[PDB]
Amino acid sequence: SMSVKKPKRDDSKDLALCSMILTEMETHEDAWPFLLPVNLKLVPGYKKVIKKPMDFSTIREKLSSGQYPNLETFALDVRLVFDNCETFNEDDSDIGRAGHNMRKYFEKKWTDTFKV
Numbered sequence: 859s860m861s862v863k864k865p866k867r868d869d870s871k872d873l874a875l876c877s878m879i880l881t882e883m884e885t886h887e888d889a890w891p892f893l894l895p896v897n898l899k900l901v902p903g904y905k906k907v908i909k910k911p912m913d914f915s916t917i918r919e920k921l922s923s924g925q926y927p928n929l930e931t932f933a934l935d936v937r938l939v940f941d942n943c944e945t946f947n948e949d950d951s952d953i954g955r956a957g958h959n960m961r962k963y964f965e966k967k968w969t970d971t972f973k974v
């Protein structure tokens with residue numbers, strides 16, 4: 859509260875660490891469904907169904923341009939990629955399976971990097 863500050867974690871490295879995580883995600887072999895925004899002409903339904911599109915290239919742009927206030931806002935956009943993927947794709951599809959794999963991959967890096 860006013861004049862009563864909790865010690866807070868050192869956030870000085872967060873930009874570099876998030877960039878590294880993103881690089882790792884961009885180079886994963888299962889990243890192909892997520893590298894660029896979904897093309898609304900090739901993909902019937904995505905426009906109406908997915909209210910907040912997101913993809914790795916949009917995250918990279920936002921990260922490079924100071925549009926994440928903090929590391930949680932970054933993680934929210936990564937998770938949004940995978941949540942949108944699950945909304946739109948059967949678990950059993952190649953893209954569905956890709957999204958599950960990429961989510962697991964991200965979350966371990968997240969925990970390892972910042973929960974420690």
Ligand SMILES: Cc1cn(CCn2cnc(-c3ccccc3)c2-c2ccc(C#N)cc2)nn1
Nearest residue numbers: 890891892893894895896897900901943946953
């Ligand atoms: C780009 C692009 C390519 N395509 C057609 C192949 N495709 C079909 N569905 C998806 C999709 C749907 C939901 C969530 C993620 C991917 C895609 C697809 C979209 C983007 C990329 C990239 N990069 C690859 C495939 N659409 N946009």
